[PDB]
């Protein structure tokens, strides 16, 4: 069946640059549209690209116009985005996705574009001038609430644990460039020993802090 | 001898006829080279391409009286390159027609067109090999000529046999020959084929046999008479170089070198 | 064969 | 089920289609099948004749021709109906009726040469297409405004039972050795699609004394237009050149890989391009199947990929003789006929 | 470049619910418009395209319709799996262009907020900063406004899955020397399901 494999992501600072991969198979590259589209944190969708390769058409959109150079290779049957000078604004969890040129009818509907039946899982794509670093754990003390505070941590992810009631709130990119967030939970105040747990794997690092 | 009233404006009707065939040529020779790019076929489209080519030069130097302004080594290229052209396709046009006979040779074809071009080159050298321009001395006005050895100007009979022997009639015969056999054995191109290849230079060689009938003093002078074969030549000439463009008519000539609603039930 | 163009006509051509 | 429909040009004669692309397979050609709709208060030509012409383009040599009489009901002429025709009838009215062609077999294919870049002139290549005119006799004259054309393509779609696999195996000897060379070709499949990746497994057993300098694979393009006469012509639509080279006494085996696709494929125009409506893209002409064996008149596609190897020179004969040796595979370029 | 004027920002529905989502195109379009469902994290799941074709495999539930210029999506039984985003896209033209999103949320009992506030830590006092802590825990919906009194980073959790409520956390970072300034810190907050803004204040 079509698949599209999407490859190519990870941590770059501003002004760098990556080059997604969506191998294709099941279909042919010069047989139909080739889309990229990226979806920003808490954001909708943005179409980013196409190409048509037999063809050999290439559309942009507003946000990439010269930036990104969609392009594609039919021996590997593979679609190349590569994405130069990527800016804060371009972190985002970038898809692969196609149209089928294949008219219902006679061979192809070359003047369609149009939905994008088949979407690529897409990776994450990050820009920030942030070396990596561990978090922070500062605690919070008074139906009595309390919590755990993690501040000053990059990349993501954040793991957290206690020893019910107990939320997460998703990280905040803060002006300095690294994240932030917390966990809490309430208990009755009759009851009120409690030790919350942090680790950060991308430096291997863990931490312990008690609140009452 | 007075000189020729109407020449200027035979001169530029042919000119005129000699565009159109140079166009035409152009057009449908580097359009076959292009593109079946058989293949005894495809050298004598090749080699035609060529005389196509060199047309240009041949109607510029008619327009002015025959003169050729062009340097030595302009005609010398251009004749040679005339010549081989026009004797390879004169061959392989026999050539084409053993061939077919002999399939009604993967070896046998490159060493056979090799050789025909061998001696299509071989055949034309000595003309262009004896070519010079020079002016004249009382006319004031350039033109280009061969200059045979004084003690043997017996060159000019050789080639003229050379010529009209090796020309006309020994594709001629052959192709007539064969095609008549082929139509015996059977479409109708066939007989446009054989008519063209006659008529497109059955002309000129007699004309060019009356030419020599002339130059060994077998015909008293008179005005008349040079008016004539003056006439005819060219007339002939642009006839023949019509073959160029008629050769790829046994095949198509492809020129590959150029308010609905949508209401619904 | 060479083009009338080029051939010369003269009553003498040796 | 959109019905491309066409008034005519003063909006007094309607035609109505049921598609613009009919399937040629061999066997038959699907008939070109509609309707026409006419007013009375601006019908006074008193007779209308619907006539599918079969046109061949370059100076607009036709092919074919057939008419049929529009309006009134030919009294000879009393044939079932086709059930688009029926149906767009019965939504439309009585002032109504229809028009059945049957194209016959045996002829082109809705080949279009493809439109050069710098070029606004009608499109070459065979095209069919309806036109309806109102008129007393067919020798009266035909207004523009008084008569309606749409054009319309009959194509073929690729052979669907996979045939052998081109193998094209070939020798080579030479007199200064008397070893000779051996080379083989071959293809994954029988039929290719447009676009579709070609893959050439050139092999090789060179024990000759010679050097081998390149190899060239191509997917050359032979398109006839087969008039009464009988053309052949060539034009290359996909080319590799691996420099894996062979020195005296080696033995090869490398496949290779060429997808022909218009991308590559537009400044050169009169490619064999499929038939346009307007100018819509359209891919390289689908291979043409000839019943059984006449050389239909009209234009007709074939496609061979031609391996190569460029073999060096010299020795007693020096560069003199050239040692060019090549092997081809006919295959197939057609569309996949979709389901 | 085009827009779509796709409505509302954002809808709660129950199980079952006829939703319905506009989607205006900023200029004429010839039904070439498509509709995904993007749950979080994963990739656009496309429902509807030409503005009148259901893709393969999708419930009929969800259905396109054309108005002229006016793209309208229902889901006329709205089941669970259909709390998600959804952009309508016009293929029409290029480049092309997606909606603002739409999300379902789901519809519950209004509930004020529980309003919580910590004081920083020694810790960072020692580190050379402070973060002042207002937490909004267990409210619905999101609509919650939340003043500083004596520069504020807020973030909503995803909809809880037993209750459907939400918290929010705001802070307010601070360097020791300006803050200490401040003696008295506070945290107003205002909900529509509260009659009146509540402050929670505490001193250095
Ligand atoms: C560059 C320009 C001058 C080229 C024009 C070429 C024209 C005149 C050629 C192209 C194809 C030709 C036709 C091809 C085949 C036939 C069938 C034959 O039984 C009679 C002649 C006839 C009908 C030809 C007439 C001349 C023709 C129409």
Known sequence: EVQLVESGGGLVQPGGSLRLSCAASGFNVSSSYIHWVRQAPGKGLEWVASISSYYGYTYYADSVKGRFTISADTSKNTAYLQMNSLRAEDTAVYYCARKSMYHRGWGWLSWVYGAMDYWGQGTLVTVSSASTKGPSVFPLAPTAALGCLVKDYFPEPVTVSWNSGVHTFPAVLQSSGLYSLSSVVTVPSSSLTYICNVNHKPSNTKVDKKVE | CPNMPNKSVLLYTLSFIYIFIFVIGMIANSVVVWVNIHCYILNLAIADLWVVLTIPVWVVSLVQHNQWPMGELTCKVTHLIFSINLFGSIFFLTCMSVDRYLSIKKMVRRVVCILVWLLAFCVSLPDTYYLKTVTSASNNETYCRSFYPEHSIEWLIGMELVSVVLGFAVPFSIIAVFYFLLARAIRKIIFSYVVVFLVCWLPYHVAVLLDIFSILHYIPFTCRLEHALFTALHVTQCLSLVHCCVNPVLYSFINRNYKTGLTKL | LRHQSLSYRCPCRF | ?339 | DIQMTQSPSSLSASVGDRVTITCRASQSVSSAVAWYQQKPGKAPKLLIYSASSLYSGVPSRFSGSRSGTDFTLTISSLQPEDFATYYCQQSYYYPITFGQGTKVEIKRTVAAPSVFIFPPSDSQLKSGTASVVCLLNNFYPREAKVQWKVNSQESVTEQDSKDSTYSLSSTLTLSKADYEKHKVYACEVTHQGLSSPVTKSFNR
């Open chain 4, 1 to 339: 089920t959109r019905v491309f429909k066409k008034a005519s040009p003063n909006g007094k004669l309607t035609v109505y289609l049921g598609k613009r692309d009919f399937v040629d397979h061999i066997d038959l050609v699907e008939p070109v099948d509609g309707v026409v709709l006419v007013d009375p208060e601006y019908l006074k030509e008193r007779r209308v004749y619907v006539t599918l012409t079969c046109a061949f383009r370059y100076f607009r040599k036709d092919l074919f021709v057939a008419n049929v009489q529009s309006f009134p009901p030919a009294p000879e002429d009393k044939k079932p109906l086709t059930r688009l025709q029926e149906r767009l009838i019965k939504k439309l009215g009585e002032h109504a009726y229809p028009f059945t062609f049957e194209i016959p077999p045996n002829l082109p294919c809705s080949v279009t040469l493809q439109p050069g870049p710098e070029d606004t002139g009608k499109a070459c290549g065979v095209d069919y297409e309806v036109k309806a005119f109102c008129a007393e006799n067919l020798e009266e004259k035909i207004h523009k405004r008084n008569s309606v054309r749409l054009v319309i393509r009959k194509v073929q779609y690729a052979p669907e039972r996979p045939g052998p696999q081109p193998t094209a195996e070939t020798t080579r000897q030479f007199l200064m050795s008397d070893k000779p060379l051996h080379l083989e070709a071959s293809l994954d499949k029988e039929i290719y699609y447009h676009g579709e990746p070609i893959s050439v497994n050139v092999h090789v057993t060179n024990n000759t004394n010679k050097t081998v300098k390149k190899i060239k694979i191509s997917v050359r393009q032979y398109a006839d237009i087969c008039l009464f006469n009988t053309a052949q012509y060539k034009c290359p639509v996909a080319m590799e050149e691996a420099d894996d080279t062979v020195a005296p006494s080696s033995t090869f085996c490398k496949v290779y890989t060429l997808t022909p696709f218009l991308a590559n494929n537009r400044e050169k125009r009169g490619l064999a391009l499929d038939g346009k409506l307007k100018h819509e893209d359209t891919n390289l002409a689908s291979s043409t199947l000839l019943r059984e064996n006449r050389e239909i008149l009209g234009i007709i596609v074939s496609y061979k990929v031609k391996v190569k190897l460029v073999v060096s020179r010299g020795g007693l004969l020096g560069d003199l003789a050239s040692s060019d040796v090549a092997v081809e595979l006919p295959f197939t370029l057609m569309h996949p006929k979709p389901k």
